[PDB]
């Protein structure tokens, strides 16, 4: 019924601009991965811990590809765009990746 968080971490969410060939900000935010038991659904929700606006509300799908570029930088390709998170710390990166990979395992 409700949204149940399976992890929380601080990161800067960015989108890889294939054209500008650069990595650009989507606008640190608070990242959480919520799970809907009443739907067996997982989502990446990023909120601006400043004005508390949601910057990202991404459904981790069935064949998603999560890549841990660096100890504090991870990305994932949906099938038509790539997202990346510049973490605030390795630890928070480690935490978010365990949830992510876990959520993906379930996802299959």
């Amino acid at each position: 019924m409700s949204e149940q968080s399976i992890c929380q971490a601080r990161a800067s969410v960015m989108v890889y601009d294939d054209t500008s060939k650069k990595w650009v900000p989507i606008k640190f935010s608070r990242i959480n991965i919520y799970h809907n038991t009443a739907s067996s659904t997982f989502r990446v929700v990023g909120v601006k811990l400043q004005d508390q606006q949601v910057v990202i509300n991404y459904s981790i799908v069935k064949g998603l590809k999560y890549n841990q570029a660096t100890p504090t930088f991870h990305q994932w390709r949906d099938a038509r765009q790539v997202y990346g998170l510049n973490f605030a710390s390795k630890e928070e990166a480690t935490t978010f990746s365990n949830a992510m990979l876990f959520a993906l395992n379930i996802m299959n």
């Binding site: 890889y16 990595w23 890549n67 570029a69 930088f73 990305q75 790539v82 990346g84 510049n86």
Partner: peptide, 5 residues
């Protein structure tokens, strides 16, 4: 995948 920023 592109290189990290």
């Amino acid at each position: 995948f592109p290189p990290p920023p």
